[PDB]
Ligand binder design. Structure first.
Ligand SMILES: *[C@@H]1O[C@H](CO)[C@@H](O[C@@H]2O[C@H](CO)[C@@H](O[C@@H]3O[C@H](CO[C@H]4O[C@H](CO)[C@@H](O)[C@H](O[C@H]5O[C@H](CO)[C@@H](O)[C@H](O)[C@@H]5O[C@H]5O[C@H](CO)[C@@H](O)[C@H](O)[C@@H]5O)[C@@H]4O)[C@@H](O)[C@H](O[C@H]4O[C@H](CO)[C@@H](O)[C@H](O)[C@@H]4O[C@H]4O[C@H](CO)[C@@H](O)[C@H](O)[C@@H]4O)[C@@H]3O)[C@H](O)[C@H]2NC(C)=O)[C@H](O)[C@H]1NC(C)=O
Ligand SMILES: Cn1c(=O)n(Cc2ccc(F)cc2)c2cnc(Cl)nc21
Ligand SMILES: [Ca+2]
Ligand SMILES: [Cl-]
Ligand SMILES: [K+]
Ligand code: NA
Ligand SMILES: [Zn+2]
Length: 805
């Protein structure tokens, strides 16, 4: 109930929202059906439209007009945005030459430059180039300010998860808005695009920017606008708020546009119909800029022009139906479209089985346009699992396609030509970023980055301390002229032991054997030097990784590789080695096929054993430093140490062996040498964070050898590839992956073919940032480089995406 009999007189677009049953006058009252009876008459004036004309110049103020051209309008703060152009001979902002804003130029009483976020739904990255002729205002912000060629959204590439990630710095799994449609089984409640449920605050986790600001004494405009409030009225409202007295005036504001998304669904991303919406959004930007210029704020405000996601060509004929795969299609609920989420239709159905559903959906039709996953098996880069609102069964849908339950869903709900939601590395889903103002850099291009990083920057722009979030604060310092955030490297928590030779061979009863019994002072001193770290500068190029948690571990040196060996997990946390362009690949000699060697530096008690692998009929083993890349036949024996062994399913060893024997040398050849750091990951609760020992669900049978859920590699070389990886003077180049350690290759439909036809495709899908690996391992990389720390932070956030340009 609302008492709509109150009045909006003197309250239009009030900032503080009044609670029921009092009627409301704020920019959301329409969404709640709660506006005072006179809200339209008073607050949504339209008379005479949105622009001054020469005949209105100097008019007698008529309060009924949408905006004013009378002499008093600048002091009232309610001129039409083109007032000074039409009436006072001024130029439009877009017609002015770009001039560097070295310092804020603000009116008296402004304590800080305001921030205005201009957000655009479905604004695909390539519109910046393809629409450039029809977007002069946006093209000027872009060329004069700081811009990226694109910004990467979060998965799923839907509106509510992306806008709320922009606002929070959080992955959807952490903020809770994991789709545009959701069921929360604890609440027993459903969230929908349409309806009242989505207004309940219990869906919305983390701390969005407007709350961060308010809590720290920075006033915020409201970030949401009822759909029926026209864009011209939104801009005029922002400009009116900016004319409030200093103690009342917000410092941060958001504008939102439903375009070009709304038309892009109807017409596809590049339909001829799309030129007009792009022109219209450009005109709205021009109104804002002209309006700021009238207020003398155009060299004071920082403006961010940012999108939520792009838009792909998708038609009703490109739909896969689960009714063509499942016998039991009426026993499941499907969240459908550009992703799939599957759960039981009834929690009382004891004959529901996820294993049979997954098997029925796996590589069943030659050109199948979706792939099923249990959510914990999704690429870790998507960070899409650790929330009860995310169904265990997930379908990753190919770009340009939909999935639906039955054909009748598609025609009893072609219509649309565009959609979005796909994998966030897909080129058509990429969106835009431009920052313009005194605090941003002048005429500066920055590399692509993820939208989770922006919250920290928006906090820096406002002098706010960000709430804990998933950005890496300092990674976007290169966008900023001032207000940079200068973090210190984390302190190492555990210091390594450096064991010498402490055990005789016969102390070990590991059930291992090696044919290594062949017996020179010219080389005996040499072998000692290698075990003491004489080659470590070659193989550990960026310092040792720091261990950021409490544990017991040893540094182990070898001719060809260095490792940090965990006495707790019985295997390396990390193994580091460098492969030059000139390195040669060799085979594992026949007599060494099954060779495993005790390490006399490490006690039998803290070592793996071969008998456990013999007894465990599902589990085999591989090596972190590859025996294929040994520098000499003698150095090769080090690669078979029990301290370089890790547990591996046979199906996984197909993947790992091809990576180590073929791909490492291919990358060294292409990149002029590479440095590789590889190791295990344990994430059994799929939270993106390193497991403690008590979270491990699987061990090698009969032993305390824990089974990794994933294996990582970080592959670093010189960005200037004229220099070899081990003699690099300037910036670095990285690619990394987090491969799932699975007992089958059911993910790769072409796996019965030679590894050359499917392994690199799998690895590309599981590409990762260094920062993802840091979370998963509790390690901190790149501690000793010649590079600035902010530059290293940017490197650690890099994702190699393997999309075309
Ligand atoms: C991305 O960045 C984010 C933000 O930094 C990272 O997420 C943080 O990770 C921390 C570790 O996982 C986590 O810290 C925990 O906080 C618990 C209290 O949590 C509440 O309070 C905070 C602060 O206001 C709030 O933010 C939380 O919000 C969550 O929950 C509500 C649901 O009510 C949601 O609306 C909201 O969206 C958010 O959900 C997300 O996180 C929760 C977990 O908190 C997930 O379950 C959801 O799926 C979703 O992803 C909360 O309202 C605190 O209780 C924890 O302490 C436990 O563990 C420690 C061990 O050290 C121990 O000392 C305690 O005893 C306690 O254990 C007890 O409880 C156990 C479980 O019930 C039980 O088994 C034991 O026996 C014990 O009794 C813990 O410190 C922090 O909450 C989140 N924050 C957010 C916003 O998500 C995220 O990791 C980053 N991601 C990556 C990849 O880096
Ligand atoms: C889900 N969601 C949000 O979090 N915001 C606020 C917001 C966040 C980031 C931003 F850059 C601008 C505005 C929204 C505004 N409008 C709509 Cl239809 N949905 C929204
Ligand atoms: Ca974990
Ligand atoms: Cl969804
Ligand atoms: K075995
Ligand atoms: Na397969
Ligand atoms: Zn859309």
């Amino acid at each position: 109930w609302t008492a709509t009999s109150g009045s909006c007189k003197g309250r239009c677009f009030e900032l503080q929202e009044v609670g029921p049953p009092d009627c409301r006058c704020d920019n959301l009252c329409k969404s709640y059906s709660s506006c005072c009876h006179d809200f339209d008459e008073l607050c949504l004036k339209t008379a005479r439209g949105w622009e001054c004309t020469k005949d209105r110049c100097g008019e007698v103020r008529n309060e009924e007009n949408a905006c004013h051209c009378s002499e008093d309008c600048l002091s009232r703060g309610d001129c039409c945005t083109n007032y000074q152009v039409v009436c006072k001979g001024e130029s439009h902002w877009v017609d002015d030459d770009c001039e560097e804003i070295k310092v804020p130029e603000c009116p008296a009483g402004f304590v800080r430059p305001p921030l205005i976020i201009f957000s655009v739904d479905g604004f695909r990255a390539s519109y910046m180039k393809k629409g450039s002729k029809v977007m002069p205002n946006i093209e000027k912000l872009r060329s004069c300010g700081t811009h990226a060629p694109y910004m990467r959204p979060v998965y799923p590439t839907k509106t509510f998860p992306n806008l709320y990630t922009l606002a929070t710095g959080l992955y959807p799994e952490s903020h809770g808005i994991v789709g545009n449609s959701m069921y929360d089984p604890v609440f027993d409640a459903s969230f929908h695009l349409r309806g009242r449920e989505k207004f309940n605050h219990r869906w919305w986790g983390g701390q969005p920017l407007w709350i961060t600001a308010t809590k720290q004494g920075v006033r915020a405009g409201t970030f949401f606008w009822s759909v029926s409030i026209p864009h011209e009225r939104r801009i005029l409202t922002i400009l009116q708020w900016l004319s409030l007295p200093d103690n009342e005036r917000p410092s941060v504001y958001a504008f939102y546009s439903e375009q070009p998304d709304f038309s892009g669904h109807k017409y596809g991303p590049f339909g001829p119909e799309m030129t007009n919406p792009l022109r219209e959004i450009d005109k709205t930007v021009g109104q804002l800029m002209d309006g700021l210029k009238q207020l003398r704020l155009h060299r004071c405000v920082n403006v961010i022009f940012v999108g939520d996601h792009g838009m792909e060509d998708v038609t009703c004929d490109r739909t896969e139906f689960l009714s063509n795969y499942l016998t039991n299609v009426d026993d499941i609920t499907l969240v459908p479209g550009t992703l799939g989420r599957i759960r039981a239709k009834s929690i009382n159905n004891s004959k529901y089985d996820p294993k049979t559903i997954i098997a029925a959906l796996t590589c069943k039709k030659p050109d199948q346009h979706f792939k099923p996953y249990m959510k914990q098996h999704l690429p870790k880069r998507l960070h899409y699992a650790n929330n009860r609102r995310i169904e265990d069964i997930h379908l990753l849908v190919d770009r340009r396609w939909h999935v639906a339950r039955k054909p009748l869903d598609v025609y009893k709900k072609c219509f649309f030509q565009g959609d979005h939601g796909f994998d966030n590395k897909v080129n058509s889903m990429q969106t835009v970023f431009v920052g313009y103002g005194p605090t941003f850099k002048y005429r500066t291009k920055v590399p692509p980055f993820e939208n989770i990083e922006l919250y920290n920057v928006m906090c820096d722009l406002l002098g706010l301390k960000p709430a804990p979030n998933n950005g890496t604060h300092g990674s976007l310092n290169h966008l900023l002229r001032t207000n940079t955030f200068r973090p210190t490297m984390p302190d190492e928590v555990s210091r390594p032991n450096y064991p010498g030779i402490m055990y005789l061979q016969s102390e070990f009863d590991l059930g291992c054997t090696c044919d290594d019994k062949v017996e020179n002072k010219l080389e005996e001193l040499n072998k000692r030097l290698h075990t003491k770290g004489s080659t470590k500068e070659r193989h550990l190029l960026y310092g040792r990784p720091a261990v950021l948690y409490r544990t017991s571990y040893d540094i182990l040196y070898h001719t060809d590789f260095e490792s940090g060996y965990s006495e707790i997990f019985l295997m390396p946390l990390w193994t580091s080695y460098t492969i030059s362009k000139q390195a040669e690949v060799s085979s594992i000699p026949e007599h060494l096929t099954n060779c495993v060697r005790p390490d006399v530096r490490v006690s039998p008690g803290f070592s793996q054993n071969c008998l456990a692998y013999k007894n465990d009929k599902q589990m085999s083993y591989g090596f972190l430093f590859p025996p294929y890349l040994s520098s000499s036949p003698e150095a090769k024996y080090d690669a078979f140490l029990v301290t370089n062994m890790v547990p591996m399913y046979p199906a996984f060893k197909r993947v790992w062996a091809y990576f180590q024997r073929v791909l490492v040398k291919k990358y060294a050849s292409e990149r002029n040498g590479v440095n590789v750091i590889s190791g295990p990951i344990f994430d059994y609760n799929y939270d993106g964070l390193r497991d403690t020992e008590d979270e491990i669900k699987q061990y090698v049978e009969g032993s305390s050898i824990p089974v990794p859920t994933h294996y990582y590699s970080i592959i670093t070389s010189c960005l200037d590839f004229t220099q070899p990886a081990d003699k690099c003077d300037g910036p670095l180049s990285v690619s990394s992956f987090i491969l799932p350690h699975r007992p089958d290759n059911d993910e790769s439909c072409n796996s019965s073919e030679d590894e050359s036809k499917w392994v690199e495709e799998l690895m590309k899908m599981h590409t990762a940032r260094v920062r993802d690996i840091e979370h998963l391992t509790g390690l901190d990389f790149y501690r000793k480089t010649s590079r600035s720390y902010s530059e290293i932070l940017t490197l650690k956030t890099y994702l190699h995406t393997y999309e075309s340009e």
